């Protein structure tokens, strides 16, 4: 099913760099240079108190020292799940280069001053709907929501940050970099955090 047609170098599969955050930064920078479409669209999995997963796309806003950062609403399914079970996993998949990056760890809600900054960095045209919507609750009246947001759209932004608008940091415990390789020997480079740094392994395809 693969369709990749842009160059996809994976020298790290040979050299086994010690720091997977450096690999992550370099893969993302390469993705930006070669023009991958929506490279930061992360399929993010959380799980409820029974261990049942749920998934959705979120956008990675930043790569931090400990992992990756995204924004969402605290009262959404993902926010409620993360509040009780911080473990999460996300995958980036770039069709053009046949590459995946899998990111596993614990996601921690950051303080309100970080949320305030993230909110002000969103285009102000986003503020009305984000203010009126209680993400993932049932929507009883579509027109009423549309009209309330239109009222707020008439203002000069920015609007106040809504209470539940929050930023999570996914602090990584493991990562995998996947490339298509040659001869169906797909190339899998797996990192796991240790007490003192990171361990690295190749995995069978």
Ligand X SMILES: Cc1cc2nc3c(=O)[nH]c(=O)nc-3n(C[C@H](O)[C@H](O)[C@H](O)COP(=O)(O)O)c2cc1C
Q: Which residues are annotated as a binding site for substrate?
A: 1, 73, 122, 130
Q: What is the DSSP string of 9-76?
A: --THHHH--S-HHHHHHHHHHHHHHHT-SSTTEEEEEEE-TTS-EEEEEEE--EE-SSEEEEEEETTS
Binding track, positions 91-110, relative to ligand NNV; x by CB under 6 A:
--------------------
Binding annotation for FMN: 56-59, 71-72, 77-78, 100, 135-136, 188
Of 65, 58, 1, 7, residue with least CA distance to 31: 7
Residue among 46, 72, 89, 97 that touches ligand NNV (CB under 6 A): 72
Asked if residue 104 binds ligand X (CB under 6 A), the reply is no
Residue with tokens 């997977």, as numbered in its chain = 20
Residue closer to ligand NNV, measured from CB, 40 or 193: 40
Beta bridge partners of 90: 44, 103
Asked if residue 1 binds ligand NNV (CB under 6 A), the reply is yes
Tokens of 87: 């473990």
Candidate ranges 25-33, 37-45, 112-120, 164-172; the one touching a second copy (CB under 8 A):
37-45
Tokens of 86: 């911080």
Residue among 18, 120, 155, 203 that touches a second copy (CB under 8 A): 203
Measured CA to CA, the distance from residue 3 to residue 98 in angstroms comes to 7
Beta bridge partners of 6: none
Among a second copy, ligand X, ligand NNV, none, the one that 78 touches (CB under a kind-dependent 5 to 8 A) is ligand X
The least CB distance from residue 25 to ligand X, in Å, is: 20
Candidate ranges 8-16, 53-61, 153-161, 167-175; the one touching ligand X (CB under 6 A):
53-61
Give the three-class secondary structure for 129.
helix
Q: What ranges in 35-111 are assigned the alpha helix state H?
A: 77-84
Residue 128 near residue 159 (C-beta atoms within 8 A): yes
26, 29, 35, 37 alpha-carbon torsion, rounded to 10° = 90
The least CB distance from residue 194 to ligand X, in Å, is: 20
The binding site for ligand NNV (CB under 6 A) comprises: 1-2, 59, 71-73, 126, 130, 186
The binding site for ligand X (CB under 6 A) comprises: 1-2, 41, 54, 56-59, 70-73, 76-78, 93, 100, 135-136, 178
């Amino acid at each position: 099913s693969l369709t990749g047609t842009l160059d996809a170098p994976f020298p790290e599969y040979q050299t086994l760099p010690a720091d997977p955050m450096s690999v992550l930064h370099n893969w993302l920078e390469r993705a930006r240079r070669v023009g991958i479409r929506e490279p930061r669209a992360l399929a993010l999995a959380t799980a409820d108190s029974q261990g049942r997963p749920s998934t959705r796309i979120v956008v990675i806003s930043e790569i931090s020292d400990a992992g990756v950062v995204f924004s969402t609403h605290a009262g959404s399914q993902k926010g409620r799940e993360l509040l009780h079970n911080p473990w999460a996993s996300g995958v980036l998949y770039w069709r053009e280069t046949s590459q995946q990056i899998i990111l596993n760890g614990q996601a921690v809600r950051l303080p309100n001053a970080k949320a305030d900054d993230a909110w002000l960095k969103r285009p102000y045209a986003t503020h009305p709907m984000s203010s009126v919507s209680r993400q993932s609750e049932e929507l009883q009246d579509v027109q009423a929501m549309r009209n309330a947001a239109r009222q707020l759209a008439e203002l000069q932004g920015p609007l106040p940050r809504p209470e539940g608008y929050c930023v999570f940091e996914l602090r990584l415990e493991s990562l995998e970099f996947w490339g298509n390789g040659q001869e169906r020997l797909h190339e899998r480079l797996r990192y796991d955090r240790s007490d003192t740094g990171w361990n690295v392994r190749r995995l069978q395809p």
